[PDB]
């Protein structure tokens with residue numbers, strides 16, 4: 001049997017899948033090892049490997065945002081990768097430690113990301129100076145009965161709403177000597193309730209649709225109906241191909257200070273179930289070379305956390321990229337400790353309850369954290 005590797009890439013039916021297909025094709029051309037690039041939705045890949053991995057049907061290389069890395073490692077999904085110091089030295093510090101857990105490196109980075117204010121230059125000449133101005137802009141221009149919006153975003157999704165919580169001094173996990181305590185969830189603190197109250201206002205006063213999803217936000221912006229969204233670098237190519245003259249700015253200052261968004265790092269990881277860890281790691285290196293990631297940026301629009309590429313004027317001074325870099329500079333990497341794998345469902349459920357007017361900020365957050373704590377007592381080895 002000739003050598004074959006399997007790779008799971010995001011199922012975007014577009015730029016990300018095509019770019020990975022290209023470079024895998026070049027690896028096969030060079031090495032003779034056949035590589036199949038299979039589209040699997042990025043946020044479904046970990047759950048799919050949870051089943052297919054032990055079943056012996058999993059991919060050799062997988063990819064998802066770094067926040068669930070600790071969870072993945074604890075569950076035995078991934079193995080550390082063996083690369084030279086020279087290969088490591090080519091990538092940004094923040095990205096490399098985000099893919100590092102328990103002193104071990106679990107991947108090589110493809111993209112570093114933060115949401116920012118993405119606006120339609122034909123609808124919005126100048127960005128609002130403050131969050132208060134931004135919210136008033138939404139309150140005046142969000143008219144769902146005529147398919148028109150001033151500001152639209154996934155306000156039912158904690159990934160996006162995080163800056164509202166951070167503004168009030170809320171944290172996902174408390175500052176117990178860095179991050180050395182599984183029981184330091186801060187998502188039902190008084191400050192966190194202040195953040196969730198801000199979320200509530202977007203549905204009660206800015207009349208944002210209930211049960212929002214990426215497709216709804218993106219589709220409406222692409223149709224020219226929305227002046228501004230809070231979204232990430234992943235949506236740029238799609239917006240530009242929909243004829244939008246896109247501007248990117250850091251989120252307007254909230255309570256007088258810089259907005260603190262999450263920073264995401266997406267890397268390639270090596271499955272613990274891989275029958276060919278040597279060859280797969282070689283493919284991972286090939287897919288994340290300077291040449292590979294420079295091409296990836298050109299096609300996908302996703303910012304590669306490669307040291308030389310981040311300072312490439314072609315990428316660094318790109319007006320679209322610049323806005324995202326600015327916002328990311330004020331942001332924090334998502335937690336990547338194992339207990340992050342218990343956070344997302346309850347907290348997003350809490351956003352849903354408040355958005356629907358079913359539970360208050362306080363009640364929703366209290367219920368969510370109780371659920372989180374209970375689930376942590378069913379985790380690990």
Ligand SMILES: OC[C@H]1O[C@@H]2O[C@H]3[C@H](O)[C@@H](O)[C@@H](O[C@H]4[C@H](O)[C@@H](O)[C@@H](O[C@H]5[C@H](O)[C@@H](O)[C@@H](O[C@H]6[C@H](O)[C@@H](O)[C@@H](O[C@H]7[C@H](O)[C@@H](O)[C@@H](O[C@H]1[C@H](O)[C@H]2O)O[C@@H]7CO)O[C@@H]6CO)O[C@@H]5CO)O[C@@H]4CO)O[C@@H]3CO
Pocket residue numbers: 010011041042043044065066067068113157158159214215232234264344345348
């Ligand atoms: O079109 C959007 C999205 O739609 C589908 O996603 C579903 C998913 O299939 C459901 O299982 C559930 O998701 C779970 C996740 O599975 C779980 O990991 C966690 O998710 C959190 C992430 O781990 C965390 O990093 C963060 O996510 C960011 C992400 O870092 C950003 O890069 C950006 O993601 C883009 C995706 O990479 C891209 O594949 C696509 O996503 C699809 C998804 O593939 C598909 O299966 O587009 C997005 C950009 O629109 O944004 C996300 C945040 O939206 O935060 C999430 C928590 O939101 O928890 C969720 C919920 O329990 O629900 C999602 C839809 O929300």
